[PDB]
Symmetry: C3
Subunit: 404 residues, 3 copies
Amino acid sequence: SLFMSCCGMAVLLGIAVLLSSNRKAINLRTVGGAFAIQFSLGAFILYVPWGQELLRGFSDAVSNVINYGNDGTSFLFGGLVSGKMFEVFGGGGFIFAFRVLPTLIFFSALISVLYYLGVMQWVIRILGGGLQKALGTSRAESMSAAANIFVGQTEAPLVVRPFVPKMTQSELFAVMCGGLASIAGGVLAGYASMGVKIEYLVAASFMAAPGGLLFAKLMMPETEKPQDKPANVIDAAAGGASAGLQLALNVGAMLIAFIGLIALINGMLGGIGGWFGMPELKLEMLLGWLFAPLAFLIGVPWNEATVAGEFIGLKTVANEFVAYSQFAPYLTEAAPVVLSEKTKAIISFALCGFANLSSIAILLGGLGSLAPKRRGDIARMGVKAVIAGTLSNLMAATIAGFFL
Amino acid sequence: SLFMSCCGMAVLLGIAVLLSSNRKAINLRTVGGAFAIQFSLGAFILYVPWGQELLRGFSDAVSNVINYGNDGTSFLFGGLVSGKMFEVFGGGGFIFAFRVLPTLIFFSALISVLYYLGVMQWVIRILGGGLQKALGTSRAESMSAAANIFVGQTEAPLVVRPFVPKMTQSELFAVMCGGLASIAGGVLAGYASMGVKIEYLVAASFMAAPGGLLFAKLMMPETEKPQDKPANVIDAAAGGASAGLQLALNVGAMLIAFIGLIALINGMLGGIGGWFGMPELKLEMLLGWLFAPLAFLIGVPWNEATVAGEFIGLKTVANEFVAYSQFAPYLTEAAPVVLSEKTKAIISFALCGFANLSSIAILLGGLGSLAPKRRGDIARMGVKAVIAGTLSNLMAATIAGFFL
Amino acid sequence: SLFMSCCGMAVLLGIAVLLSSNRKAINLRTVGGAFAIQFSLGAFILYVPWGQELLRGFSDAVSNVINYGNDGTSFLFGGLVSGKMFEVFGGGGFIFAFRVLPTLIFFSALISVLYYLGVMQWVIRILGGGLQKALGTSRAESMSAAANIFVGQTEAPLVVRPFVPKMTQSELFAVMCGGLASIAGGVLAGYASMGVKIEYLVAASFMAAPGGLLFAKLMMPETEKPQDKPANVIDAAAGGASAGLQLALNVGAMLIAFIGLIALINGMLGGIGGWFGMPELKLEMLLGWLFAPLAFLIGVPWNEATVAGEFIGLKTVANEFVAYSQFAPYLTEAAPVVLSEKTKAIISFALCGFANLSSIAILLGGLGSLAPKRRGDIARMGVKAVIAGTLSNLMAATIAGFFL
Ligand SMILES: CCCCCCCCCCO[C@@H]1O[C@H](CO)[C@@H](O[C@H]2O[C@H](CO)[C@@H](O)[C@H](O)[C@H]2O)[C@H](O)[C@H]1O
Ligand SMILES: CCCCCCCCCCO[C@@H]1O[C@H](CO)[C@@H](O[C@H]2O[C@H](CO)[C@@H](O)[C@H](O)[C@H]2O)[C@H](O)[C@H]1O
Ligand SMILES: CCCCCCCCCCO[C@@H]1O[C@H](CO)[C@@H](O[C@H]2O[C@H](CO)[C@@H](O)[C@H](O)[C@H]2O)[C@H](O)[C@H]1O
Ligand SMILES: Nc1ccn([C@@H]2O[C@H](CO)[C@@H](O)[C@H]2O)c(=O)n1
Ligand SMILES: Nc1ccn([C@@H]2O[C@H](CO)[C@@H](O)[C@H]2O)c(=O)n1
Ligand SMILES: Nc1ccn([C@@H]2O[C@H](CO)[C@@H](O)[C@H]2O)c(=O)n1
Ligand code: NA
Ligand code: NA
Ligand code: NA
């Protein structure tokens, strides 16, 4: 029943302790409160009636903004994003390149506008302030954690830019983990446009802030001593649209290559596996068979662990965008395998994060440009930070599955 | 009758004098001739029979070039830009992204070719030479004004690149105004592909050269003393296509964001306005109500001033591309409001310009790269230059409405 | 019969000798073996039964990879690349921008992956090693020649990057020729997706390695004395996709401009030619009339030389991508002119190369960045290198036509 979930949380906590740089340096107030916040946050917005209402209210607001932004892409691509497409091409009428990718552009512009107005800084200051006061974490790493709820791993540390070059190894590691444990507002709307429940996306985003700090301070406790704009609103929107455009082009090119490469891998795996009497061997079977214990450990039923392992594994070995692309058909009525609603939630939560190996190179560029003499430390702690970010997503998925 | 137009011109001239840096330094020959040229140019090509024939001849030639360039986009997007699209999606068969944006690429390549051959330099030298000889303006600012008829605000000063770092504040201001009062050959073909009459676009482009110098020397008179390539034609075309591609991507991303943001603004304005008994409140109503006196002042009928104010205002607070995108449906048979032909002309002329706040940042980058130690002056005169560019477009619209 | 082909080869060899920097410095072993290899390679894979089987086996493998990569573009553009497109738009259902361009992205990612694994370096080391041992050419220029079979003119010298700044003028010229005589794996799959026979593309690619060295050492004999990575596989794929994206955008923008410009040229040529009683004058007629002797010289029948001259000429004055775009309809059942299978082969081989004037500027950037103090030599030998690359493609076409 609920025993598998509580054991799941214990195992995830245990792995982080075993991989800690110094277990005797672990601050029990910090890691105790961080888990308490992430757990209570899950209890609040997924179990308690009032918290569920606030979550649905924020989600519907997000859903309304997406529809508003869709007027922009409707102007550019016209009938190619209309209802007539489904009458002609059926299911293939949904053109991903025109339906999902342009949303990255609009939300990037919106976020840039909200930064110019000071709305974002206002929310981050409140959330980040409450974290450091309750966990004892430093000012800079707390703000970066709160910022990571809404923006990406490279944009989040920008709110504490002048503090990055001199922050401790534990601080830098937490900053990295904050970005790896979360996603971004732009891609969130993209995943929502692909069928992923917004309530799960918003929840996992907020739970990433304490969850990121949790496993960061578990695996890399503080052993040192920490310390302590566009001309107008229209320029802000333009700059945001430009950054979103570049992102949309990068994501699209990645999806063409990766999905194409996976198809190539499956073709080769069919021939190689055939030598051992398994010609039906594919990448999905390997990932599913290898991540099934992990899926089962976080609350996925025994008969659904293998399928759930495919998506979780693909997110790890590649990225969450590719995983969501393969998981999205399982959210429609034309799903090859009908999954339970709890399993759908667990997969949604466990995928909601930038935790992968390729994100290390991105951290080296974005976060590294803020502190060029610290690129060595980023590369050194890269793998451990990904593991920490993975544990945070898995913990959030276990918590979500518990109250569901 | 015509009294409202002549008063309109007087008011526009009056505002520039009131905002002048030194009214006693205003050269009457310069500002007198500049207005005389812009007025006579309007009289020539919009009223006098022969001038109307030369305008239609140049416009049809432009219209033929656009159709020739459309063979390129027809090859890439095939049936998505064919007549079958209108049979399937109806009005939504016109895909803006494939119909308008690729034209920016072709014309950028063409202009680059005409620069390599020396055709552009030949025309600019004649027009720019006649301006300085009649107005007394300096050599450099005159060529940049003439160049601005065909190319953008950042490409126009390139013909006088080595003179920019040492030109006077009045010269630099005129260069800025020349770009803000005009558009570019690429986007001109785009607006033409959206339904805007080419005759109006060409006319307003040529009237921008004396009009730009007019309000530049009115608001910033000269108080100082002025002074005084690709390997082959195929490389020129390739470089032009590359620049046009980058432009086409920027415009498209901007249109997705801005239109999407306007839709978001309208949603919020509906809720905010509802608090004051106006739930139907939108961005269009605010702009229309605030720019109606300005539209009425330049010759737009009282019962059409509010609608015309929406487009003029949107061009100012954002850019002319967004304004044209909302004005284009009013040029078809399926227009929500049937406007008079004179009103259509006034709006077309008043929108034909890069005069907006975001163009300042663009001037800081493009024009600023030509003179890095002058970026301070560009930022300082930015707002006044936009105002001057706005007055030039409004003057051209008043002149156009007069002879129509 | 076969006398026209052998004379064709002799003429091509003769031109290179006449344009040599020093005919008395020509190494007979080098240029003798290089021609022997290119000729025997053609004999092997186009005439001899076993060699034809190995060619078809490699081609079908290439054809399978393309289909695998098409799963990526099928996900992004959905029904716009499905069979329904041909039912609605007929022949115009084939959208080039979604059918061909995305293939550049996938193959660029694949090649980047094969480089990370060491597969490419392994094949290049074998082919490049056999060339230098048989021709006496230096180590660096041999590897660059072999690398050019699979990758582009700017990516090929990267395998011998630290040797480029100090290599002789003859070596540098050979490196340039190796890239101009060949194409790239990405665009190869593009041309294959346009209808060009893969067997011809693969054959011409392999024949480019000895053919490139052949005319390089003929026109520029050695008179001096020669001398002598991503964090993971997923990062390699991402970087490749990014480079392919940039390439796909450049090619698409070029095709819009160039084809559009050709349409504009044809319009002007119709008016200019009309003055001399030839209003039907077009760019195709000029190129066909001027390259017909060259087409006839390499084995194209007298009544097909003019049509074949259009494609060969267009490849020279522009690029092979534009030429292939105009030659592709001649490979379908709806061809305006039914050509013989041998003529189709000759045109396919003669077009398979980056040999054009615009590739010089590209060599100045790519190859020049590897040796900034050698950009002068690259620009100096630019034209001769293009001629050499042209002769290599023409030789390969003559050889192909001989055994066919
Ligand atoms: C489409 C899906 C198909 C399935 C593909 C699965 C392949 C698994 C990739 C793992 O490769 C490793 O990843 C590390 C992470 O980058 C690299 O470490 C590199 O970076 C580390 C830190 O960032 C350092 O510790 C190392 O020294 C450095 O080698 C390491 O070299 C590399 O072997
Ligand atoms: C989609 C449409 C929705 C409607 C939106 C309308 C909003 C109006 C924007 C105006 O904002 C101002 O614009 C100036 C122009 O850039 C800025 O001046 C900045 O730049 C000037 C000069 O370029 C300087 O004088 C100033 O010091 C400097 O603040 C200024 O800060 C900013 O407040
Ligand atoms: C769409 C198709 C329409 C048909 C168009 C056909 C036009 C033919 C273009 C030829 O122009 C020449 O090309 C050279 C090659 O770049 C240039 O040499 C330049 O570069 C050379 C070496 O790279 C140097 O030798 C020269 O000094 C230098 O002028 C040269 O200037 C230029 O006149
Ligand atoms: N705003 C964003 C969006 C995405 N990303 C990177 O792209 C991968 C796929 O979404 C993510 O996993 C992440 O590596 C990013 O760094 N910042
Ligand atoms: N050639 C061009 C075209 C456009 N622009 C800038 O983009 C805005 C929208 O067209 C314009 O208002 C202007 O700011 C530009 O600077 N140069
Ligand atoms: N990988 C590639 C692909 C293309 N190119 C350049 O682009 C032209 C058209 O394919 C080619 O003729 C060549 O100039 C390149 O340099 N490298
Ligand atoms: Na984040
Ligand atoms: Na201009
Ligand atoms: Na090559």
